[PDB]
Amino acid sequence: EVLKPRTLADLIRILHQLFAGDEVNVEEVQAIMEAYESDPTEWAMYAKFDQYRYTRNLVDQGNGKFNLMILCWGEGHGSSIHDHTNSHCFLKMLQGNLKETLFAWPDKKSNEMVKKSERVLRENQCAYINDSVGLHRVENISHTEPAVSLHLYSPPFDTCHAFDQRTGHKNKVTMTFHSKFGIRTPN
Ligand SMILES: [Fe+2]
């Protein structure tokens, strides 16, 4: 009985409704994002890759309630271990596959970080994370094919922390957009 968006535009319209209010039903959003069948014809205009690192490509600003963006992972590209700055964070596969590794939070002592979970996200699957769930690292499983994912963050945020797996020490990172609405940013 999940409402099924027929197009990426349908999905955006539904998301505007689900985030209009004060309450957000996480499992409802997750099921609707998963029900959208990834269609490259609809999102190729956002799929702008870089040789060396993954790119973040803004799709929609959600009337200030959320940011919807597409992340393009080249061959072998991966993220650092990071948090999500107290926001809801949804990630849905559009092409290829990402491995998500969940980590525990470090405390004050210096120590190797501890893995809590490890999985590969399947075709069209939508995962969810927030800071109470843990930290995570995401990476393209493939060294021969790209991965593309659709990310929804609410509230939007443009800073996070990256964590050193060897010690748990963290550094603030400013996140930037490679493109917005299909247009390359100055960089
Ligand atoms: Fe993340």
Curated annotation (Swiss-Prot):
Fe cation binds at residues 82, 84, 136. InterPro entries: CDO_1 (IPR010300), RmlC-like_jellyroll (IPR014710), RmlC_Cupin_sf (IPR011051). Its EC number is 1.13.11.20. Its cofactor is Fe(2+); Ni(2+); Zn(2+). It catalyses: L-cysteine + O2 = 3-sulfino-L-alanine + H(+). The keyword Metal-binding applies. Pfam families: CDO_I. GO terms for cellular component: cytosol. There is a cross-link at residues 89-153 (3'-(S-cysteinyl)-tyrosine (Cys-Tyr)). Transmembrane segments: none annotated. One of its GO terms (biological process) is response to cAMP. Binds 1 Fe(2+) cation per subunit. Zn(2+) can be used to a much lesser extent. Ni(2+) can be used to a lesser extent. Disulfide bonds: none annotated. Catalyzes the oxidation of cysteine to cysteine sulfinic acid with addition of molecular dioxygen. Monomer. This is Cysteine dioxygenase type 1. It comes from Homo sapiens. The gene is CDO1.
